[PDB]
C-alpha cells in the first residue's frame, strides 16, 4: 500500500494516509541554528531491557523493514508517563550510496538508523490503540556509522537471511537491548514529531541519542542487501533499500538537547 | 491551491498533480556518492543575454513565483537543440532562517537559488508546449550565498514593490543577464530532472553552476520580505517565504560533473 520508491514512495503517502501532509512531521535535520539546551532533559532509565535469554521474540518481515517484537515489562523510565516497548526495526540506504539514516546531523546522514518503539501504556493498552493518540508514541533513536564490528547488533543481523522475503519470520532468543545504544546516552536530542511511516501520525516523542554506534562494513552491506519488500514467489522482486524518509521542513521550532 | 506550508504543502502536491509522486524529481542533494565526470560536458555558450537596457521586461507576480519574462532570441548554443530562454525566477528562504536554495551541496542549503528557465525552441512553439515532452526545458541554476552586495541581482530585486501580490505586473529595463551567472560556468552538474514546483513534470535538463554568487543579507532581507503570494485585497494575507522543495530521492540516477575535481 507504499513503499519508498516508484509512484508509491513518499510523495504520494499523504493521498491514503492524510497525516503525511500534515503538521509535526519526522524527520528532521537536526542542525546547530535549531538545537537549544534544556536542564530539563534528564537521563531516561531503560527497564526490562535485559531480556529473558529463555524467552524468543518474533522477527518479521512485513515489506518495509524489518521488525523485533519486544514484551511489554520492558519500558522507559523518566518520562511524564511509562512507555513501553513494542518493537525495534531499522532504516538504511544501499551498497552504492551507503547514508540512510532518517535524522541527519548538521545536514549529513548516518549509514543507518535504528527505532526503539514504545507506547503510553499508563494510558492505552497497545501500541495500536496508542498510535493516533494524544502522547501515544516515544521513540529511541540510535544513528549507526561504518566502523568496528558490534557483536550486539549481530544478535539481530545474524538472523537476516531467515527473514529475507515478505511473510517471512524468525524467532530470536531474547538478549540485552540496552548493547543496541550508543555511549553517554544521557545526550541526546528531543522533539515532538511523527512516526516517519505511514500513516505519519503527530504522535511521537522523539530521542535521538547524540552519539552514534559504529557496526562493520561488513555489517551493513549484510543489512543492505539482506532484504527484499516482496514475497519469496513474486516474479518481479523488489530489494528492501533506501527505506528512509526524506528530512522535513521544521520551521519556527526547535530541537532540545541534554547537552550544551 | 498549492503552496510551500500547511495542508496544501509539497507532501500532498502529488494529490492533484501527478508528475509531484512519479519519477526523475528535483531538486536533489549533490554528494560525492553520487557524481561522475564526464569529459563530453563541454562549455555553454550564452547567446543574446545582454538585453538591451532601452528595452522593457515583463516581471509578474502569479501567487507561487515571481517570473522575469525573457525574450526568446536569448539562448543557450552548446546542448543537442537550441534552447531559448522563457524566464528566470528564485527560490529563497525567510528572515529568520536565509537558507532556501532548492538543491544541496553535501547535505547543506544555500541562501537562495537562481533558475533561467529555457525551452528546446528548434521542437516546440513555446515553453508551455515544451514542458510535456522529454528534456522539453532546460534550467540554469545559480547557487546563491550571503556574501557582498550585489549590484547586477538588484537591477531585479529594485523592482520587487511593483510585484508585491499576486495578479501585478511591472517592467524591469534590460541588463545582461550573463552578469547573474558565477565564476567558471564550464564547470557544472548535469543531471535529467523535473520542474521543482507543481505540475512537477519530469521534462527538465538541469545545469547546476558548481560556484555560487553571492549576494548581501540586506538584499536577503529585502528579497524574503518583498512579496506575497496572496492579492493585494486579501484578508488572509501569507508571505512568500521558505518557496523551495525539499531534496527528493535519487532513485538510480547519476549527477554528471564537466570537472573532474
Ligand atoms: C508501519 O509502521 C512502522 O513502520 C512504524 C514506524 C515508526 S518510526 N520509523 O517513526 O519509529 C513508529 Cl514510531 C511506529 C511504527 S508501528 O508501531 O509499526 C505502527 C504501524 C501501524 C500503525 C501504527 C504504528
Ligand atoms: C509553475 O511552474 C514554475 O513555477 C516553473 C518552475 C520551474 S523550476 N522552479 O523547476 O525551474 C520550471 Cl523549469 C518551469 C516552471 S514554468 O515554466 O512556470 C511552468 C508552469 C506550468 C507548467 C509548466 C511549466
Ligand atoms: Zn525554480
Same mark, same amino acid.
Given at each position: 500500500?507504499?513503499?519508498?520508491?516508484?509512484?508509491?514512495?513518499?510523495?504520494?503517502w499523504? %493521498?491514503?494516509?492524510?497525516?503525511?501532509?500534515? #503538521?509535526?512531521q519526522?524527520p528532521?535535520?537536526? =542542525?546547530?541554528?535549531?538545537?537549544?539546551?534544556?536542564?530539563?532533559?534528564?537521563?531516561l532509565?531503560?527497564?526490562?531491557?535485559?531480556?529473558?535469554?529463555?524467552?524468543?521474540?518474533? #522477527?518479521?518481515?512485513? *515489506?518495509?523493514?524489518? %521488525? #523485533?517484537?519486544?514484551?511489554?515489562?520492558?519500558?522507559?523510565?523518566?518520562?511524564?508517563?511509562?512507555?513501553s516497548?513494542?518493537?525495534? =526495526?531499522?532504516?538504511?540506504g544501499?551498497?552504492?550510496?551507503?547514508? *540512510?539514516? $532518517?535524522?541527519?546531523v548538521?545536514?549529513?546522514?548516518?549509514?543507518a538508523?535504528?527505532?526503539?518503539? =514504545?507506547?503510553?501504556?499508563?494510558?492505552?493498552?497497545?501500541?495500536?490503540?496508542?498510535?493516533?493518540?494524544?502522547e501515544?508514541?516515544?521513540?529511541?533513536?540510535?544513528?549507526?556509522e561504518?566502523?568496528?564490528?558490534?557483536?550486539?547488533?549481530?544478535?539481530?543481523?545474524? =538472523?537476516?537471511?531467515?527473514?529475507?522475503?515478505?511473510?517471512? $519470520?524468525a524467532?530470536?532468543?531474547?538478549?540485552?537491548?540496552?548493547?543496541?545504544?550508543?555511549?553517554?546516552?544521557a545526550?541526546?536530542?528531543?522533539?515532538? *514529531?511523527?512516526?516517519?511511516?505511514?500513516?505519519?501520525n503527530?504522535?511521537?516523542?522523539?530521542?535521538?541519542?547524540?552519539?552514534?554506534?559504529?557496526?562493520?562494513?561488513?555489517?551493513?552491506?549484510?543489512?543492505?542487501?539482506?532484504?527484499?519488500?516482496?514475497?519469496?514467489?513474486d516474479?518481479?522482486?523488489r530489494?528492501?533499500?533506501?527505506?528512509?524518509?526524506?528530512?522535513? %521542513?521544521?520551521?519556527?521550532?526547535?530541537?532540545?538537547?541534554?547537552?550544551?
Open positions: 500500500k507504499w513503499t519508498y520508491f516508484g509512484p508509491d514512495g513518499e510523495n504520494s499523504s %493521498k491514503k494516509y492524510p497525516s503525511c501532509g500534515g #503538521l509535526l519526522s528532521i535535520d537536526l =542542525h546547530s541554528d535549531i538545537l537549544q539546551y534544556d536542564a530539563s532533559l534528564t537521563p532509565e531503560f527497564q526490562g531491557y535485559n531480556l529473558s535469554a529463555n524467552k524468543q521474540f518474533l #522477527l518479521t518481515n512485513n *515489506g518495509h523493514s524489518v %521488525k #523485533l517484537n519486544l514484551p511489554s515489562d520492558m519500558h522507559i523510565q523518566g518520562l511524564q508517563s511509562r512507555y516497548a513494542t518493537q525495534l =526495526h531499522l532504516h538504511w544501499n551498497p552504492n550510496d551507503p547514508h *540512510g539514516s $532518517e535524522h541527519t548538521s545536514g549529513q546522514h548516518f549509514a538508523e535504528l527505532h526503539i518503539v =514504545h507506547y503510553n501504556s499508563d494510558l492505552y493498552p497497545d501500541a495500536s490503540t496508542a498510535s493516533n493518540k494524544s501515544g508514541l516515544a521513540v529511541l533513536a540510535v544513528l549507526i561504518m566502523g568496528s564490528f558490534n557483536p550486539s547488533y549481530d544478535k539481530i543481523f545474524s =538472523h537476516l537471511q531467515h527473514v529475507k522475503y515478505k511473510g517471512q $519470520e524467532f530470536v532468543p531474547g538478549f540485552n537491548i540496552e548493547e543496541l545504544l550508543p555511549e553517554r546516552t545526550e541526546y536530542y528531543r522533539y515532538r *514529531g511523527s512516526l516517519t511511516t505511514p500513516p505519519c503527530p504522535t511521537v516523542l522523539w530521542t535521538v541519542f547524540r552519539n552514534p554506534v559504529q557496526i562493520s562494513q561488513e555489517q551493513l552491506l549484510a543489512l543492505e542487501t539482506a532484504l527484499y519488500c516482496t514475497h519469496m514467489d516474479p518481479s522482486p530489494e528492501m533499500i533506501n527505506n528512509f524518509r526524506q528530512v522535513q %521542513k521544521f520551521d519556527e521550532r526547535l530541537v532540545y538537547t541534554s547537552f550544551s
